[PDB]
Amino acid sequence: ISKKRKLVADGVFYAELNEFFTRELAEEGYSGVEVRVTPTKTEVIIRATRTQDVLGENGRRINELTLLVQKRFKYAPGTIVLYAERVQDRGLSAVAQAESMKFKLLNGLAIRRAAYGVVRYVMESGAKGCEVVVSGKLRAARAKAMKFADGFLIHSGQPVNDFIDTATRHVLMRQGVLGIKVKIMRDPAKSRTGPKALPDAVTIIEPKEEEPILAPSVKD
Amino acid sequence: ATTKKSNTRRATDRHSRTGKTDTKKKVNQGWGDDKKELSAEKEAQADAAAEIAEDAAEA
Amino acid sequence: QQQQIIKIRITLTSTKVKQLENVSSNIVKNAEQHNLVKKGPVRLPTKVLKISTRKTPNGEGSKTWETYEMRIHKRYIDLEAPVQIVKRITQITIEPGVDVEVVVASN
Amino acid sequence: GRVRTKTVKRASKALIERYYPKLTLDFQTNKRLCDEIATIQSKRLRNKIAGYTTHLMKRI
Amino acid sequence: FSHPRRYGKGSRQCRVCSSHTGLIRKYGLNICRQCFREKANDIGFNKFR
Amino acid sequence: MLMPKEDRNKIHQYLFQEGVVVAKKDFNQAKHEEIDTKNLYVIKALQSLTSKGYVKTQFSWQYYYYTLTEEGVEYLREYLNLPEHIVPATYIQERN
RNA sequence: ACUCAACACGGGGAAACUCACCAGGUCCAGACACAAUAAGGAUUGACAGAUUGAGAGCUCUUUCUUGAUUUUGUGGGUGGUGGUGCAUGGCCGUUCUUAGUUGGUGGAGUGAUUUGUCUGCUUAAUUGCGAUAACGAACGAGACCUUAACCUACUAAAUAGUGGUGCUAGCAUUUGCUGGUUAUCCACUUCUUAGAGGGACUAUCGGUUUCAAGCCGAUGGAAGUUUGAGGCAAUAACAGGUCUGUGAUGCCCUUAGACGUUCUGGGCCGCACGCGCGCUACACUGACGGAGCCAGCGAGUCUAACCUUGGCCGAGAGGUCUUGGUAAUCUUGUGAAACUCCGUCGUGCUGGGGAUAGAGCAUUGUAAUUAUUGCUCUUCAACGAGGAAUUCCUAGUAAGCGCAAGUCAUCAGC
Numbered sequence A: 001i002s003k004k005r006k007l008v009a010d011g012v013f014y015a016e017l018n019e020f021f022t023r024e025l026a027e028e029g030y031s032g033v034e035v036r037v038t039p040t041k042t043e044v045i046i047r048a049t050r051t052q053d054v055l056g057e058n059g060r061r062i063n064e065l066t067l068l069v070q071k072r073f074k075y076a077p078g079t080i081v082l083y084a085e086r087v088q089d090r091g092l093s094a095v096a097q098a099e100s101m102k103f104k105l106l107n108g109l110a111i112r113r114a115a116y117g118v119v120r121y122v123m124e125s126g127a128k129g130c131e132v133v134v135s136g137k138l139r140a141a142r143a144k145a146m147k148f149a150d151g152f153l154i155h156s157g158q159p160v161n162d163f164i165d166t167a168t169r170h171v172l173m174r175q176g177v178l179g180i181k182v183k184i185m186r187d188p189a190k191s192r193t194g195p196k197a198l199p200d201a202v203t204i205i206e207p208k209e210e211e212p213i214l215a216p217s218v219k220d
Numbered sequence B: 001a002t003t004k005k006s007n008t009r010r011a012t013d014r015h016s017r018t019g020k021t022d023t024k025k026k027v028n029q030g031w032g033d034d035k036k037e038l039s040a041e042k043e044a045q046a047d048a049a050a051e052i053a054e055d056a057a058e059a
Numbered sequence C: 001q002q003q004q005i006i007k008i009r010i011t012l013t014s015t016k017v018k019q020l021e022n023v024s025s026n027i028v029k030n031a032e033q034h035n036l037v038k039k040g041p042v043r044l045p046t047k048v049l050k051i052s053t054r055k056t057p058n059g060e061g062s063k064t065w066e067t068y069e070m071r072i073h074k075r076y077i078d079l080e081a082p083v084q085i086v087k088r089i090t091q092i093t094i095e096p097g098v099d100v101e102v103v104v105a106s107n
Numbered sequence D: 001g002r003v004r005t006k007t008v009k010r011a012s013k014a015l016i017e018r019y020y021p022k023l024t025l026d027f028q029t030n031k032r033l034c035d036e037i038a039t040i041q042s043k044r045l046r047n048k049i050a051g052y053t054t055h056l057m058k059r060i
Numbered sequence E: 001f002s003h004p005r006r007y008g009k010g011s012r013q014c015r016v017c018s019s020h021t022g023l024i025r026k027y028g029l030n031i032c033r034q035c036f037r038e039k040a041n042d043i044g045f046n047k048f049r
Numbered sequence F: 001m002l003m004p005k006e007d008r009n010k011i012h013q014y015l016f017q018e019g020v021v022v023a024k025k026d027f028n029q030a031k032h033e034e035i036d037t038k039n040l041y042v043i044k045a046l047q048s049l050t051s052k053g054y055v056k057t058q059f060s061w062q063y064y065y066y067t068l069t070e071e072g073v074e075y076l077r078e079y080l081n082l083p084e085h086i087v088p089a090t091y092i093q094e095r096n
Numbered sequence G: 001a002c003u004c005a006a007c008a009c010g011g012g013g014a015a016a017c018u019c020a021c022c023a024g025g026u027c028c029a030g031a032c033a034c035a036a037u038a039a040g041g042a043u044u045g046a047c048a049g050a051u052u053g054a055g056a057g058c059u060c061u062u063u064c065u066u067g068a069u070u071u072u073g074u075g076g077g078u079g080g081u082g083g084u085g086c087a088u089g090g091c092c093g094u095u096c097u098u099a100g101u102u103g104g105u106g107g108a109g110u111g112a113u114u115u116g117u118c119u120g121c122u123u124a125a126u127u128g129c130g131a132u133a134a135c136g137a138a139c140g141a142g143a144c145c146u147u148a149a150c151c152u153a154c155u156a157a158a159u160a161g162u163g164g165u166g167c168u169a170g171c172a173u174u175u176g177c178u179g180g181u182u183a184u185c186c187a188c189u190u191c192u193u194a195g196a197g198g199g200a201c202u203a204u205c206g207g208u209u210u211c212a213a214g215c216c217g218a219u220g221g222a223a224g225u226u227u228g229a230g231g232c233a234a235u236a237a238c239a240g241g242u243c244u245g246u247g248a249u250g251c252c253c254u255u256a257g258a259c260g261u262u263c264u265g266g267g268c269c270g271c272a273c274g275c276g277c278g279c280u281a282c283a284c285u286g287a288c289g290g291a292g293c294c295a296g297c298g299a300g301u302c303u304a305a306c307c308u309u310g311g312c313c314g315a316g317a318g319g320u321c322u323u324g325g326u327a328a329u330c331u332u333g334u335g336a337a338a339c340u341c342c343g344u345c346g347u348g349c350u351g352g353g354g355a356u357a358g359a360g361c362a363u364u365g366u367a368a369u370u371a372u373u374g375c376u377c378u379u380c381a382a383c384g385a386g387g388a389a390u391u392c393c394u395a396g397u398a399a400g401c402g403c404a405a406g407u408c409a410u411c412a413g414c
C-alpha cells in the first residue's frame, strides 16, 4: 500500500477509535487518545479522569475494548496493547469539563448553577480564560443562547491552535437537545513545549545603574 | 408562465403564527431568574470548591 | 556472516516535521559514532494531500470552499553496515508518528 | 499604507527611555541589539520595532 | 432479495453514517463531505491557506 | 426471529468464549467475519440478548459492538450447561 | 432554496442503483413480557406445472421435508430521504471581513447611564497623530500561521542535476562540434529538492504638511501597492438554510395490504412558453493544411484489475501481445493549447458558423430504446456584433488559452 494511502488510513484508524471510546467510555470520563506505532506492537493510551473504575476487577470489564479492537481492525492478540493513564490538569481538559457539565445537567442542577459551577472550576486551576455557551430548548418553547465568559481569551490567528482548547457535546433530555461549548484558554507561561508567550507580547529588560564620571582606576 | 413567485411568506416572518407565547415563569424556570442570581451564583463557588478538595487529595 | 557489510536504505515517512528531523538526526549521529559509511538524509519533495469541500452541508449561502491539507514528509538515509549494528540503530529511534522502513539493497 | 500599530510605537518609546545611551541612528545595529535586551518571539516585529526606534532617534 | 451492486452510488457508502450522497473517495477515505469536515483535524487534515 | 438452533448455539458459544462480538451493520452479508453463520442471525440474536439485559451494545461507524454482562454470563452458562469454572475471555486478565 | 444572502446551488454530471415519485410483486429484518397454541407436530421450506415480467412455492394443485426457534392475540418496540428548520443541536451563510466591542481607576449624573470610545489631519483599519476629564489597558484590526518571490552561504542527495573522464556513433580534421551508455565510473550541489538560518524596517536621501502621524519623488535592492495571495477572524444578531449528511434530536404521524425494506419496469430528461448561470459563433488580427514545439498543479493497483509505456492490427474510434510503477524512480520531459513559421482561400452567410437530421462502425455496463459516450461519411439551420437593461475588474491583474483534480463503470459546455 502507498504512503499517501497508508498515513490517511492511520488517520481514519485514530478517528474511528476517538469516536468509539467517546460513547463507550462516556461515564468513565474519557479525555482523549494517542497511539504509538512500533514495528511489533501498537501502543494506545486512553487518557481519562475516572482511572479507578475504568480498570477494576483485576480486569473483568476493561479489555472488552481491546477484544473489540482486535476483532474489528484485524489485529492479533499480541500486537495491540492499550493503557489506562491518569489525566493531568483536570481543569484544562475542555473535553472533561463539557463532559462534567452533561452529568450536572442530567441529575438536574439548573443551568446557571451548572455553568457558573464549571466556569469557576476552570478559572481556579491555572486557566487564563474560559467560556461556556449553552444553546437550545430549556423549559420554554423558543430556544436561546446564554454565554458564561470569565477572564481573558484571544479569538483570532494561529495562537488559537496553540493555546485554546475547544470541545463540544450534545446532551439529551425530555424537551429537545441542548448543546455545550467549553473554550478554555491556557496560560502561555505554563507552556511545557512550544512558545511561552503571545506574538504581540514585547518584554523589555531594565538596565543596571551605571555611575558617571569615574577616574582611570587601572588594574593588572 | 410569466407570473413570478408570489413571495414565500417573508413579509410576516417575525410575527409568530402558532399563536402560543412563552410566559415569564416558563423562561425563568428553564434559564434561571435574574432576581435570584445571588442564590444561584453563591452555590456555584460551593460546588466548585467541593471538586477542588477531591482534586487535591490524590497523593 | 555478521561482519558482512550490507548496503541498506532506511526510509522515514511522517506528517510531523520535528519528530522526523529528530529521528533523522539521531540516525546520522549514531552512524557517525560507529564510523559507518553514510549517505546523508536525502529530503524528498513533501507530498501535499489536498481535499477541497464546500463549507456548507446544504445548498444555501455564498459558494464558499474550504481546502484541507495533509503534508507527508519523506526522507531516506543510505548506510553501509553489518546486520547487527543496523538492528541496533533502528530500535533506538522509534518515535510515535514516524514510520521507519528498512530495505536491503539487492541489485 | 505604512502606519505603525501601538505595539510598534509603544515598545519603541519603551526602549528609547531605557537605552538612549546605547543605540544609534542606524537600523542594522539596532535590530541586533533588540534581540539581546528585549525578548521578542517574532522576527518580523523585531524588525518593525527597531525601524521605528531608528525613526525616533533621527528626530531626537 | 438482491441485485448488482459492483459499481455506482449504490455500492459506495460512508464509513460513518451510511449516506451515498457527497462521498470523498480521494485517498480511499470514503467519508461523506459533511462528516469529513467534522473529523478532518482528527484524521490529520488541517487548514493552512 | 426464526433462526436454526445450530446457528443460535454457534453465536451463544462464540459470545461466551470471547465475551465480546463485533458485527458490521450489513443484513445481506452471507457469512459473519468471525462466526460461521449469517450476519443477520448474529445481529438479531444479540439484539434479543440486549433487550433482556444479558449483552450491552454500542453502535459506531456502522458496527455493533457487543459486550457480555454479568447476568449474561450466568444466562449463557445455564443455556450451554457449562460447569461454573469456565469463565469468558473477558475475565482472563483484561487490562485494556 | 425565491432581492443582495434561490435559480452549473444541495458537492444534485439521476440509464439500474442512487431514490425520496409512479405502476405492480416479495420479505419482516414484528426486540421483549404475558397468555393462547401447544410435540397423536406449534411452524419455516420446495421440484413440476398453475400463476406471474419472472426459475418470486408469493399464491394455487399436491404430500413430502422440519422438531419449538416461532406463529396467534394482548400490551410494547423497531425503523422511517414520513411531517414541523416557526420545537431544537451542530454546521454554514449573511450583517462583515466592514471596523467594531468591552470593562479598571478617575470625572459627570438621584438614576437608567455617560465620558474614556473626540472637532481636525491621517490610515487598508477605533491605524495612528493630535485635541483632551480623563488615565492606563483588553478583545477585534495588527502581530501570528501557510504560501509565493532573493540568498554561487551552509546542509546533503541517482528516486534531482551538471562537468570532464570509461565508452561509443556521425559530421570534420584543429583540439573539435553533436549525441547514446541514468551505479562502467569519479568529482561537485550552480540549476532541482527541503532543512536550518539570513534578508525588509518604507532602508537612504530630497520634497510637503498641526515640520506629528503620514504621504509623494529619486536612488539602491530580489522585492518598496499591508512586499503578492490566502488562512484564522470580536460583541452580537437573523424566527437566513439544513430534521433529504448523521445511530444529533423533541413532539406528532405511520408501523404487515407499512410512509420499514427489497425486486421488476417507468419517472426525475417529459414541451405552446417566461427567467438565470454558461459553451460555440458571427471571420482576413481569421478558417483550413503541413511544419515548428514550450508548462505547471496533479493522481495512480495486491489480492485488485488502478495510471499505462513500447511492439503489432485498424481510416478512425478502438483492439491486441508484453512491460514499468504502491510512485521526485514507471506512466510523464503528462513533447497541453493558444502561439511560431511556410503554404491554401479572398469577402461572398464564403472554405466563417456547425445546430437539426440519416446511415454505419466501436467503447463502458446485467441493461444504452427516450440517440451514455467516441469515431466515419452525409445533411449545413439561426447568427452580418446584439433593444430596454445589467455583471466582473486596477498587475503576471483583466481577457484569450488549454491541463489535472473532484464526481467517475461510462459521461464536462460544471
Ligand SMILES: [Zn+2]
Pocket (backbone or CB within 6 Å): E014, E015, E016, E017, E018, E019, E031, E032, E034, E035
Ligand atoms: Zn458520513
